[PDB]
Scaffold this active site. Structure first.
Site, PDB file in Angstrom:
ATOM      1  CB  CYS A   9      -0.996  -0.021   1.177  1.00 50.43           C
ATOM      2  SG  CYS A   9      -0.238   0.030   2.836  1.00 50.43           S
ATOM      3  CG  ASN A  12       4.351  -1.704   5.040  1.00 45.55           C
ATOM      4  OD1 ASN A  12       5.473  -1.949   5.491  1.00 45.55           O
ATOM      5  ND2 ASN A  12       3.400  -2.637   4.942  1.00 45.55           N
ATOM      6  CB  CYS A  14      -3.644   1.346   7.320  1.00 39.20           C
ATOM      7  SG  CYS A  14      -5.365   0.873   7.558  1.00 39.20           S
ATOM      8  NE  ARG A  15      -4.473   1.736   1.518  1.00 41.51           N
ATOM      9  CZ  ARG A  15      -4.195   2.413   0.412  1.00 41.51           C
ATOM     10  NH1 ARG A  15      -4.965   2.278  -0.666  1.00 41.51           N
ATOM     11  NH2 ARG A  15      -3.146   3.230   0.387  1.00 41.51           N
ATOM     12  CB  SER A  16       0.204  -3.574   2.683  1.00 43.30           C
ATOM     13  OG  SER A  16       1.068  -2.617   3.249  1.00 43.30           O
ATOM     14  CG  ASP A 126      -5.016   6.048   2.215  1.00 44.78           C
ATOM     15  OD1 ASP A 126      -5.263   5.735   3.394  1.00 44.78           O
ATOM     16  OD2 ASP A 126      -4.024   6.718   1.858  1.00 44.78           O
TER      17      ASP A 126
END
Ligand code: 6VX
Length: 154
Positions: A9, A12, A14-16, A126
């Site tokens: 993401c 690195n 949150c999402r990933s 995001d």
């Protein structure tokens, strides 16, 4: 060990790391964590060295999935070592493709994680400026996509 996936993401934090932790749990629950190298990285240098955003942790704690990661930026080596690099949005995808063209060896298949969603929600947006519901949506997307990817890679 045999198979490897890197989730990517922007930051690195949150999402990933959520995708990484969800995926690691899935393979662990299916007795095959030993067969997988799982990691996550950022396209940017905004958050290098930092832990996952606590807003994401709150969500993960609700769902009972521990999450631990030190943010790091994608490197040239990652293209050579990972079987799959699965990212969140079209900006991530573009940045990854740009970097991949700078290396000699690109083993990695680079794809949107959302391309695996049976519900066809292609982009994992995001949630930085979002609310609790946005984090929950990201979590649910990660669960659906990670499950489908494990089932049958592209
Ligand atoms: O890093 C993130 N977003 C960023 N937004 C800004 C805005 C201004 C400057 C730097 C950045 S990095 C995302 C994210 C991070 C924390 C919480 C939710 C989402 S992430 O990509 O899911 O980690």
């Amino acid at each position: 060990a045999t198979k490897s996936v890197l989730f990517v993401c922007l930051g690195n934090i949150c999402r990933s790391p959520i995708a990484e932790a969800v995926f690691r749990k899935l393979v662990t629950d299916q007795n095959i964590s030993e067969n997988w190298r799982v990691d996550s990285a950022a396209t940017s240098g905004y958050e290098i060295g930092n832990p996952p955003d606590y807003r994401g942790q709150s969500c993960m704690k609700r769902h009972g999935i521990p999450m631990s990661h030190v943010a790091r930026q994608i490197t040239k080596e990652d293209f050579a070592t990972f079987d799959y690099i699965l990212c969140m949005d079209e900006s991530n995808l573009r940045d990854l493709n740009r970097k991949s063209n700078q290396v000699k060896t690109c083993k990695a298949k680079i794809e949107l994680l959302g391309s695996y969603d049976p519900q066809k929600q292609l982009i994992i947006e995001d949630p930085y400026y979002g609310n609790d519901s946005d984090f929950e949506t990201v979590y649910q997307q990660c669960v659906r996509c990670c499950r489908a990817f494990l089932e049958k890679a592209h």
